[PDB]
Design an enzyme around this catalytic site. Structure first.
Site, PDB file in Angstrom:
ATOM      1  N   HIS D  41       0.777  -1.257   0.000  1.00  0.00           N
ATOM      2  CA  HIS D  41       0.000   0.000   0.000  1.00  0.00           C
ATOM      3  C   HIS D  41       0.775   1.254   0.000  1.00  0.00           C
ATOM      4  O   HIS D  41       0.206   2.303  -0.202  1.00  0.00           O
ATOM      5  CB  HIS D  41      -1.020   0.053   1.149  1.00  0.00           C
ATOM      6  CG  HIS D  41      -0.392  -0.028   2.525  1.00  0.00           C
ATOM      7  ND1 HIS D  41      -0.253  -1.185   3.221  1.00  0.00           N
ATOM      8  CD2 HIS D  41       0.145   0.944   3.295  1.00  0.00           C
ATOM      9  CE1 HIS D  41       0.280  -0.925   4.422  1.00  0.00           C
ATOM     10  NE2 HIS D  41       0.610   0.351   4.430  1.00  0.00           N
ATOM     11  N   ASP D  79       1.877  -8.246   2.934  1.00  0.00           N
ATOM     12  CA  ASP D  79       1.948  -6.830   2.513  1.00  0.00           C
ATOM     13  C   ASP D  79       3.453  -6.410   2.344  1.00  0.00           C
ATOM     14  O   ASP D  79       4.017  -5.601   3.112  1.00  0.00           O
ATOM     15  CB  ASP D  79       1.279  -5.936   3.561  1.00  0.00           C
ATOM     16  CG  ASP D  79       0.750  -4.696   2.988  1.00  0.00           C
ATOM     17  OD1 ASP D  79       1.194  -4.149   1.930  1.00  0.00           O
ATOM     18  OD2 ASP D  79      -0.295  -4.229   3.558  1.00  0.00           O
ATOM     19  N   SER D 159       4.194   2.464   8.199  1.00  0.00           N
ATOM     20  CA  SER D 159       4.078   1.427   7.141  1.00  0.00           C
ATOM     21  C   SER D 159       5.454   1.227   6.491  1.00  0.00           C
ATOM     22  O   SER D 159       6.071   2.207   6.057  1.00  0.00           O
ATOM     23  CB  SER D 159       3.176   1.957   6.079  1.00  0.00           C
ATOM     24  OG  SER D 159       1.831   1.700   6.576  1.00  0.00           O
TER      25      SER D 159
HETATM   26 ZN   LIG Z   1      -1.410  -2.902   2.707  1.00  0.00          ZN
END
Ligand SMILES: [Zn+2]
Ligand SMILES: [Cl-]
Ligand SMILES: [Cl-]
Ligand SMILES: [Cl-]
Ligand SMILES: [Cl-]
Ligand SMILES: [Cl-]
Ligand SMILES: [Cl-]
Ligand SMILES: [Zn+2]
Ligand SMILES: [Zn+2]
Ligand SMILES: [Zn+2]
Ligand SMILES: [Zn+2]
Ligand SMILES: [Zn+2]
Ligand SMILES: [Zn+2]
Ligand SMILES: [Zn+2]
Ligand SMILES: [Zn+2]
Ligand SMILES: [Zn+2]
Ligand SMILES: [Zn+2]
Ligand SMILES: [Zn+2]
Ligand SMILES: [Zn+2]
Ligand SMILES: [Zn+2]
Ligand SMILES: [Zn+2]
Ligand SMILES: [Zn+2]
Ligand SMILES: [Zn+2]
Ligand SMILES: [Zn+2]
Ligand SMILES: [Zn+2]
Ligand SMILES: [Zn+2]
Lengths: 202, 203, 202, 202, 202, 203
Positions: D41, D79, D159
């Site tokens: 993402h 991810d 992230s």
């Molecule tokens: Zn993600």
């Protein structure tokens, strides 16, 4: 969020913040043509040729960078110093190179009383790479002679900050310090007001 | 996270933190053989036989517990007291039972100037069951004679903490605190004070 | 959550909080029949007929609102003022209209020494629309003569707050100020106790 | 001060911080020659020619600014995205224009278990004008398959941050979030390690 | 003071705050004549006859108290509920008894992109005795279909808050959550916009 | 000070805090003779012979240390596990070596409604060297079947904490947290869950 008696000013280019100026170590504000006020413990650290910056806000810019031309300390015990700057900016502000077009002086308030809400506006964190203006709110605790005491969150760089009432009129100049603590200002007695008016650049 | 001018020291067993000692109520630091410095308002609460601990950090251990053997207040107005300890630890540190092998004194700085970054290192919270060392950073506001003022977050237990420059050299000893970026007040080591301290280092 | 040396008192209608009263700007506490104590810099702001409220907590109510009937400053240097109230409440408390039935005075402690845990109980935030009582804990740093110093988080409204030991006995009265800072009270010496006992309403 | 599970890193030019890179919106870290890792993402927001900066700290400078040359998402559910950069810096670091000489990849840890102390190192605040690296500590709560959960203070910019053990060895990559909250990473299973090793620039 | 991505709104009677309304448990905002928007998880707690209050700010007053007349949930999965109120106030605001004279609807923004600054305005603390509006700022992380994600400090009462761009135009409605965390809004796709326009009181 | 919806419990040796127990990583509470309740994601990290501690508060002591003797997960989807302990303390509490004399189970509330004030009481910071009990207050947002949602400040270690009403009656067990006034998620005790728990209380 939470109640907070001190918050960052996000736009320093509107009144009343356009009356405030930054030193590397402290705060001052405009009192008249080419003329600012701060404390004596601040001015001792500066000399002719040193720079002040008009209402800066990190990288959002400022009203210009100006050089000091004269430092005049009040002869009484109160912690008041009048600083005159050269009118022609070293670096211009959005309203041009003239100091006075980029700043606004304050109206003196008719008086001040215990319990009224005041604001102290200034640069609380000394010797930073970027200038961040904060507004500290609180009540007046006492007005005695040339002493005004208020309950607020003030920090070392607030030395020289204006203390304004709810109509942005001037009630004092800060000089010494959640935190809701007593903080100490000079209240403008007639004799102090006379010294200031006499040392405004003509 | 957030900007913060005071943070917990997680390893007190490296320099400069091995210069700092704890009292039950306050801080001090090592100045020479068997000798530490603190404030006069701290030393008045202590006497011969009372205990200080070298660079403690909660249950991570410490450089030993030592007993006080002498208290010598500075004769001038500045808030400085010399304390000597018994060289033989009551409880050893990792470097053994000798006090001096478990601590490190500081070199004096060449001077200090308004605007320079200092650190105050000490035990800010007095009368706790566990000793936790914090480092408070901030700029020097003023140096005048034996007075050094800096803007920092200091607390009651920081009485006696060293004030160091960016190269861990000694600029002052903290004595009074009267976010928080507030003026805080140290004794700057003038030649008269340095001479008193040198003359009172255990021989 | 986190360690915190100051927390909001959520029920002010139990001991010891029932010994604490609020002024608009500060704290006081009950010393005897119709009689409270505060600082001299607090009482300067009040006059006969001004009002104090007994152990308020926001809109959870209170022990009643009472009028000041007499103000007696301690003749010595110490920052102590005795205030007597009219016994008949302006607005009642849950125990009726009599001031004394809605409050509780403290027992004096035998003494106080460095390192013991105290609590300062009071209304730290001056000039608020609602009264919120906080309890500030910390150790005694020093006791000498009439001066007691402790390390705590106190604020401008705490002027006048009782300083109690771990058994809720009285060791002093706050007068001047994370924050673990030295804070300053008046320790009740025999001369001060004597002034107070002499000025309790009869 | 106070206990705090997240603090600002003041020198990002030492190991392990020299393994961490910033995107405008998130974090990544170096896995090999000209190769970094982040989340899927994060990489969705970037393209060839976009820039990443090596271990920045405000205006204290950085290890250089580098251009993205390839983006490879992991085919599995986890991810993970591998990003390769051009070796030749757009703006140099202190060790020169070569990306590899200004950064340090991590050694994989032998494994990870509930209760051990980890650190998540990254740029928690997305889309700021200045990059500020924070270090978040806390214990591992659970390891199962490719899922590692730890209790820490993480924020949206984290992230892509590495999750290291107490010896600075790599145990995972953060992907989703006082605050001592469960926070979630990808634990490097053999299948994931294999994808990464296969996509390190040659 | 400190950087803070959430601050109390001190004056709720100016735009954009005059578009926001409080439920006992949550937030909503005005979309047209007599018509407000909130989440479905909020509206399930309310029924015809229940009250909302227009832009309140504790005891500084508000734009009036109004009763709910109709609740219409969007038939898709998105967390959107249209609530109509009776036009005639139960308690008037400063501009009189008509709902629409005391509130202002927002213009929809032309679109939204990752990295732009947004504000979420609403009543973050549910079931309080006094309504306090907070403004939470942060960047947009992603806009995908009817999903908009931003990094901000949001709390349970923010359910139903408008998400506005820097020109106070509408980009979303918040529905689920220092804290710079991803927070989740409904982005107004054409099909959602059509449902809303169709259920505005005529 | 400031408003705060979470504060440290200074005396854990009074009701309701004598209902709560600590795991190394999480919270639980007493439901009956030798029996405690926690989440399934907690109990999976424990086994027979592992230790829980009754209402600890750092070095102020505790109600004893006890060993786990049985783990029984609820067969439904809700995140509930029953744990029985050996009645004989490994280390005694002030009321002796019997577990039950040192703890107190809760009465169930008559139900719970949106808007009512609850408290979550537990050990929010997992894997610490000292156990510190916090109380998190806030309003109930929703009750639907076995789901109770409240707005509060809860943290990783609060897994397993009781959720009580204003008269200390039990409304739920906390299981997930996904200023801070955030939606937080508990299991509401429906009749099927109550029956499972009653059937698994040590006889
Ligand atoms: Zn993600
Ligand atoms: Cl104060
Ligand atoms: Cl100050
Ligand atoms: Cl202090
Ligand atoms: Cl969590
Ligand atoms: Cl997040
Ligand atoms: Cl939430
Ligand atoms: Zn909030
Ligand atoms: Zn001065
Ligand atoms: Zn505070
Ligand atoms: Zn942060
Ligand atoms: Zn002293
Ligand atoms: Zn502050
Ligand atoms: Zn916590
Ligand atoms: Zn006084
Ligand atoms: Zn602090
Ligand atoms: Zn403070
Ligand atoms: Zn501290
Ligand atoms: Zn917290
Ligand atoms: Zn938080
Ligand atoms: Zn500040
Ligand atoms: Zn919903
Ligand atoms: Zn934070
Ligand atoms: Zn306060
Ligand atoms: Zn679970
Ligand atoms: Zn917050």
């Amino acid at each position: 969020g939470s109640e907070n008696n001190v918050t960052k000013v996000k736009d320093t280019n509107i009144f009343p913040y356009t009356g405030v100026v930054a030193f590397k170590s402290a705060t001052g504000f405009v009192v008249g043509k080419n003329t600012i006020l701060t404390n004596k413990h601040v001015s001792k650290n500066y000399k002719v040729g040193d720079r002040i910056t008009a209402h800066p806000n990190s990288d959002k810019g400022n009203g210009g960078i100006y050089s000091i031309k004269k430092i005049i300390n009040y002869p009484g015990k109160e912690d008041v110093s009048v600083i005159q700057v050269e009118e022609r900016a070293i670096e211009r502000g959005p309203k041009g190179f003239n100091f006075n077009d980029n700043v606004t002086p304050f109206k003196y308030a008719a008086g001040a009383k215990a319990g009224e809400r005041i604001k102290v506006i200034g640069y609380p964190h000394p010797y930073k790479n970027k200038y961040v203006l904060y507004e500290s709110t609180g009540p007046v605790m006492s007005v005695e002679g040339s002493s005004i005491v208020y309950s607020a969150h003030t920090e070392s760089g607030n030395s020289g900050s204006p203390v304004l009432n709810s109509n942005n009129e001037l009630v004092g100049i800060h000089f010494a310090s959640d935190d809701n603590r007593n903080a100490y200002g000079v209240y403008f007695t007639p004799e102090i007001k006379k010294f200031i008016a006499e040392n405004i650049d003509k």
